[PDB]
């Protein structure tokens, strides 16, 4: 599924991400846009052999099982294929564990380089929320 900007903000709000660990909704929409272009089926392979999956590009080295990342963990206790669903529930539940891990949203390279310190409220402007 390819989400619209406001469609995705509403879905994230209903799943409890607005001000989760102090990050306003616009931070989460900004991260999704530059990680996946709002596509739940996005994958990307890394140099180390791990793969990033879904709307928030969650990595198989730590967070999910894909059957081909030797010596990796599965901290969200899910197959990586669950993160490519049209239903964002698994991705949102896993993202809550990541953002709690000590580095906040700096875990997402595109958030640190393209969203942090910007007017992120722009990402939910005009939306009925
Ligand atoms: Cl957009
Ligand atoms: Cl915001
Ligand atoms: Cl594995
Ligand atoms: Cl594990
Ligand atoms: Cl699993
Ligand atoms: Cl959903
Ligand atoms: Cl933080
Ligand atoms: Na893994």
Curated annotation (Swiss-Prot):
It is an enzyme of class 3 (hydrolase). The keyword Hydrolase applies. It catalyses: Hydrolysis of (1->4)-beta-linkages between N-acetylmuramic acid and N-acetyl-D-glucosamine residues in a peptidoglycan and between N-acetyl-D-glucosamine residues in chitodextrins. GO terms for molecular function: beta-N-acetylglucosaminidase activity; identical protein binding; lysozyme activity. It comes from the Eukaryota. Keywords: Allergen, Antimicrobial, Bacteriolytic enzyme, Disulfide bond, Glycosidase, Hydrolase, Secreted, Signal. Pfam families: Lys. GO terms for biological process: cell wall macromolecule catabolic process; defense response to bacterium; defense response to Gram-negative bacterium; defense response to Gram-positive bacterium; killing of cells of another organism. The keyword DNA-binding does not apply. It is found in: Secreted. GO terms for cellular component: cytoplasm; endoplasmic reticulum; extracellular space. In the egg white and polymorphonuclear leukocytes. Disulfide bonds join 6-127, 30-115, 64-80, 76-94. The active site is at 35, 52. SUPFAM superfamilies: Lysozyme-like. Residues 1-129 form the C-type lysozyme domain. InterPro entries: Glyco_hydro_22, Glyco_hydro_22_CS, Glyco_hydro_22_lys, Lysozyme-like_dom_sf. Substrate binds at residue 101. Belongs to the glycosyl hydrolase 22 family. Monomer. Lysozymes have primarily a bacteriolytic function; those in tissues and body fluids are associated with the monocyte-macrophage system and enhance the activity of immunoagents. Has bacteriolytic activity against M.luteus. Lysozyme C is capable of both hydrolysis and transglycosylation; it also shows a slight esterase activity. It acts rapidly on both peptide-substituted and unsubstituted peptidoglycan, and slowly on chitin oligosaccharides. This is Lysozyme C. It comes from Gallus gallus.
